[PDB]
Amino acid sequence: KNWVPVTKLGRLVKEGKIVSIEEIYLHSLPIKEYQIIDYFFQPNECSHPLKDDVVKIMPVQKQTRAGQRTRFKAFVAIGDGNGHCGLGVKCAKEVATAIRGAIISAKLSLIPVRRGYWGNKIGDPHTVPMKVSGKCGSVRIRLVPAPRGTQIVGAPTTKKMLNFAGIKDCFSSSCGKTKTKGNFLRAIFNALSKTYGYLTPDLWKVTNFDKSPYEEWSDFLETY
Amino acid sequence: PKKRRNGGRSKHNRGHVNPLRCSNCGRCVPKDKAIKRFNIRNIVDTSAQRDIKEASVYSTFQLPKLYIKQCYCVSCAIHSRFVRVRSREQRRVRK
Amino acid sequence: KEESIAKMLICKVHIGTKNLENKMKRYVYTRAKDGVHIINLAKTYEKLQLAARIIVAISNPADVVVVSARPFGSRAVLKFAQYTGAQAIAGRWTPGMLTNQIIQKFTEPRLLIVTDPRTDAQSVKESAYANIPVIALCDSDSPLEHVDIAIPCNNKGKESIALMYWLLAQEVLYLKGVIPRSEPWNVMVDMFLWR
Amino acid sequence: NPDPVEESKKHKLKRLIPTPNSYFMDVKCPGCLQITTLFSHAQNVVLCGSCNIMLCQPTGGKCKLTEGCSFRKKIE
Amino acid sequence: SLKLQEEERERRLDYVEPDTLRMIKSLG
Amino acid sequence: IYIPRKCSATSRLIPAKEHGAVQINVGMVDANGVYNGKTETFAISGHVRQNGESDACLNRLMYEKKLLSFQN
Amino acid sequence: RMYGKGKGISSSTLPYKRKQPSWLKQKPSEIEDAIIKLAKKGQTPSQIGATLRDNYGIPQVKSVTGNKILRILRAQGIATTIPEDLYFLIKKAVSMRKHLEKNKKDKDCKFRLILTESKIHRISRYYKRKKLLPSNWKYQSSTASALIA
Amino acid sequence: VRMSVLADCLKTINNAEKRGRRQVLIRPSSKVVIKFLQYMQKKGYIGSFEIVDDHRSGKIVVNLLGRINKCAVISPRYDVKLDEIEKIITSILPSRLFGHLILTTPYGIMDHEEARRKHTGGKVLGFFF
RNA sequence: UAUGUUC
RNA sequence: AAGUUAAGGGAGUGAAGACGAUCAGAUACCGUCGUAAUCUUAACCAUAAACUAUGCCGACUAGGUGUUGGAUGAAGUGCUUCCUUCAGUACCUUAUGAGAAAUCAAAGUCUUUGGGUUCU
RNA sequence: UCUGGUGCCAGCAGCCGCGGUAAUUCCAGCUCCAAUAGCGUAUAUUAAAAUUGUUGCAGUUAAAACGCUCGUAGUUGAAU
What we know:
It is classed as ribosome. The entry lists the keywords ribosome, malaria, single particle, translation. Single particle cryoEM structure of the Pf80S ribosome in the POST state (nrt with P- and E-site tRNA). Chain A: 40S ribosomal protein S5. The structure is cut from a larger assembly and holds eight protein chains of eight kinds. Chain A is of the alpha+beta class and 224 residues long. Helix content of chain A is 26%, strand content 21%. Chain A folds into two domains: 1-112, Double Stranded RNA Binding Domain (2-Layer Sandwich), CATH 3.30.160; 113-206, Ribosomal Protein S5, domain 2. In chain A, strands 1-2-3-4 form a four-stranded antiparallel beta sheet. In chain A, strands 5-6-8-7 form a four-stranded mixed beta sheet. The radius of gyration of chain A is 20 Å and the shape is globular. With 95 residues, chain B is α+β, with helices and mostly antiparallel strands. A two-stranded antiparallel sheet of chain B has the order 1-2. A two-stranded antiparallel sheet of chain B has the order 3-6. In chain B, strands 4-5 form a two-stranded antiparallel ribbon. Chain D has 76 residues and is mainly β. Chain D has a single domain, classed as N-terminal domain of TfIIb. Chain D has no helices and three strands. Chain D has a three-stranded antiparallel beta sheet, with no helix packed on it. In chain D, strand 1 (24-28) and strand 2 (37-39) form a beta hairpin. The C-F interface holds C 23, 26, 42-43, 46, 50, 53-54, 56-58, 128-134, 138, 143-150, 174-177, 180-181 and F 19-29, 32-35, 39, 44, 46, 49-56, 58-59, 62, 67-68, 70, 72. Chain H binds three RNA strands through helix 1.
């Protein structure tokens, strides 16, 4: 909205020198601010919105000398439903601030997921193009490509996260203690992130390295 | 849950080690596990040295030392303060 | 060429400490019969110039930072930064300045220069949270984690460090159009040295 | 880069191409002018052809030979 | 930080070992 | 959808949140040896940099590009 | 290792050159006669090869002539009815039993004798699966002392 | 006891390009591992390997392209009919779009796709993707 | 390096 | 190891037992004594936190400090050290390796799940 | 977290639990939910169970490496 300039990437996005998010994904730059989505995914002048929801609230206690010091840990799942997903956790004394912090951290952890076609280039991608496994704690989750006519056959949390990721077709298989929602969600998110890190034969061709935003806009921020 | 990597002793490539006996309580303790202190002490303190050297003869008398070489069990060593409990991270450090 | 070689043969950069390490085998020529290794310096020279060719590629030099936690590296890094366009930080490194965006100093660069990875491993560690390439003045025993351009040289000697940074700056200035290659210099290594 | 390796002499036996470390030599005692074949890492005791003398002492290694004489490889 | 360190700054500003020898002679 | 870049050392593609992978730019020179506008670029993966063989990988890559001839 | 521990990779590695060494102008017209005379004088083929390598300078009898030493011994009819290694194992077992009879308290010797007899039985089974040993060969432990023959 | 030679070969290959060493030495060569390597070559997963033919069941040096996700053997060599190719494929390979399940068939070493196109499925050897 | 229970 | 059988041995220690203490009690811890046992021989018994709580064989994957036994090459003084290597044996660090974690160079190379085999 | 009655009783509750005066859990009324001419209950069985594991489990510490070695049957076996 009306922030005071802080960082080079944040200002560069504020001035709008970067057109998309794929370039910062390509250069693996860390995203440090919500300001990078404030002037990126506004409710107006945008193609698709970002959907937020709270998947779990955990009362968590410390057991001090006097009492317990109970706080609340909020898990939220962000996702456009088109190939971008994120998971966020935040612990705070009050559920409201925990939720807000979790939303901020999920937006910060927003990642691209390689949605993969399975039938034809003409059809849009509908499933994971791969058997991808994610692990966190004890729970291991496996996502398997499915034909187009399937829904997400998985646990409710698996459905909720894969819908946010944009995958409309998948077989799931879980082992371990999936009762722990935090580890379950983290494993699902780990598999989704791993989708884009596999080196499928179609990515064997070498490509030229386009300039990173920093050197391409170094002169832009020079007078400041 | 396996407090120490070495199991509290220094046995490797070995099946059995003959035990020795604690100098303080007489407990049987494996030699590789017992806490050994080789004490090379003076027969007397400095004041008694200053007394008997001047009360002695040869005008150059040097008092003999006492070589003790005691060994203690874990309980006796801990109680007599030869070893401390130490912290988990500091537990690894030997010298 | 010959004059440049004569201008650095007289120093003590040849000598590298013990603890040969494993990834400096290529750079070490042999261990002396006394027990102290010696650097080729014939690898040091082009490591210097390629480090300079990747430093000069940064469009604005203020986007490159140089660190040093040693008393006799502090003067060298500050004067190197002043003579080039870079901005350096010497002495104590606050351990959040590369990843914490709230602290008033921050100053995340595009390239990092390290005098000794052992002494300022904190900066080398934080570079791996922000994609900073890192050039390091590695010694015969220095670790090579999260460093890409190893410069085989001495990190203990005050004269070694001062000459190291001085000829680094001289070569980056040569790569710039500031002065031609052939002309002799007017800045003395003792000026870069530590008092 | 293990194909064109060259300085694998200090590498232990059964390197990339397993070759024995032993060899065969011809020995000539001074003032004796005799020719005979000998095996490095010999296990027995050998005697000269012209004049019966001691040549090598069989030990766990490459033997000790004699104080003088000239021994040369038979490799071509 | 004041105007006293600048004057002091201005005041302050103003064969070989055989293995190295054979190394250098090998190099040229 | 985008095409993630690939490490020039191990041909392993670099995910979106490595933050350890780096881009290296080496500048060319003219006849007099002065830096010119054009450059050339590399890409080194975070796992190589963490292992510490990044220096050797860059030496090999620069040799292949004929940037310098000291080999190792 | 068959029993106990220890890999012990110590061995001898033949040279790459399969053929007769060039420096050996010696003719194979009498090397077989040399080994035959040595065996007649009484030597097991292992020590025949060792003596040939040391005192005769003719390594790899197989390289000098395209036929191996125990094979030429068999072709000439000199080869013993019991193979070398099995006979050595039998001799070791006989010595161990002779010692044990005096010292029945040597539990370690008893254990190693069991091990040696296990090896004897395995290798004899192999040798009689081949036709190198009569089908009724058994190695009873009573007359093995004279079975060496 | 090595038992299977190709299993050790493929495990060494896998460890090698997980380390990204770009060149690996396989000590016990054999004709089966040679044909497996040529099939990997023709599918483009490895470079130009060269077999060091010494007099002692020689070795192989294979160049890696950092291009194989996983190569492995399947032991025992289950005999598969042409009918159960699909059942093996959906259980072994990561997708129906890439990856190869290697069979030994009456007409030689081949992958599942060409085994289908040529009929006559045989015994399973391994896979790589 | 006396002993010294229970809720 | 204890235990059993039969001879021998029998110092010291010492299940039992006997006293003396302590204690509310104390048949215990402490002290004095003391039988069996401990030792040897010849037989049984076949069990231990018999424990690295980690079956055996094979391949691969990383740096360093040692140390035990050989072998290789060279050098301060016929004699000592350094280099390489094999086979043991530990330790330190490191993991974009594993694990629930403690931790592990194997407990790694496992949903990218199949080297062989036994037991539970 | 609707209204009465009961008040560790009566009772409910597959499991966790509710009930000692404000019972969102008993006994009732109202309302709501689910499936619907069908809906509960009991027992058995399958999936869930990768908690019988060939695919596909686990065995340092959660249960679980025989005290150790030899060894037959069995299983498995270098390259050409």
